[PDB]
């Protein structure tokens, strides 16, 4: 993290979010397998497909602006969120308690992303990145809908 300008901050956070999404796609298959509820399992599989589209949006964002260039880095916060989900799996039997706990872990993941994309959209707008702003808002709305979905599942987990 070496950041002097708003443009450097945008690149830094976009690079972070990019790493977070790639990590999350690696983890989602196991989350889908670890759940006993098939509706929740399919929500994890749907969320994987959506995350693929979101990573594609980042590529398009990079293409859209000269001097947007991603840095290779590991998003450590996402790394820890994913490990906490894996600790849930390790600490439970495959039942409705695991399900409740996996939804909770995944909503922290989604909320980390909701924050990140909200910030990215604000900064894109500030920097005059019009195409990027459009694409970032598309992801942000999807992240919000996924979280809502997960809440509906947590509530009908009774």
> Where does this chain bind its own copies (CB under 8 A)?
1-6, 8-9, 13, 76-77, 80-81, 84, 87-88, 91-93, 96-97, 100-101, 103-104, 107-108, 110-112, 114-116, 118-119, 122-123, 126, 147, 151, 154-155, 157-158
50 binds, among Mg ion, its own copies, none (CB under 5 to 8 A by kind): none
54 binds, among Mg ion, its own copies, none (CB under 5 to 8 A by kind): Mg ion
18 binds, among its own copies, Mg ion, none (CB under 5 to 8 A by kind): none
Report d(CA 95, CA 54) in Å as an integer: 31
The answer to whether 57 and 149 are in contact (CB under 8 A) is: no
Contacts with 42 (C-beta within 8 Å, 6 or more apart), sequence order: 32
In eight-state DSSP terms, residue 36 is S
Q: For residue 142, give the nearest of 38, 22, 55, 14 by alpha carbon.
A: 55
CA atoms within 13 Å, Cβ hemisphere of 123 = 18
Pick the closer one to its own copies by CB: 53 or 80: 80
Give me the least distance between CB of 83 and its own copies, in Å please. Answer: 9
């Amino acid at each position: 993290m070496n950041i002097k300008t708003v443009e450097d901050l945008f690149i830094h956070l976009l690079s972070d979010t990019y790493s977070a999404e790639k990590q999350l796609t690696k983890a989602l298959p196991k989350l889908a397998r670890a759940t006993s509820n098939e509706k929740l399992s399919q929500a994890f599989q749907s969320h994987l497909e959506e995350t693929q589209g979101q990573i594609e949006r980042i590529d398009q964002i990079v293409e859209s602006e000269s001097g947007i260039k991603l840095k290779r880095m590991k998003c450590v916060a996402m790394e820890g969120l994913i490990e906490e989900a894996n600790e849930v799996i390790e600490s439970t039997e495959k039942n409705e308690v695991r399900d409740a706990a996996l939804i909770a872990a995944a909503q922290k993941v989604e909320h980390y992303e909701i924050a990140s994309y909200g910030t990215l959209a604000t900064l894109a707008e500030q920097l005059g990145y019009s195409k990027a702003l459009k694409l970032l808002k598309e992801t942000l709305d999807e992240e919000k809908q996924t979280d809502l979905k997960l809440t509906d599942l947590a509530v009908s987990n009774v």
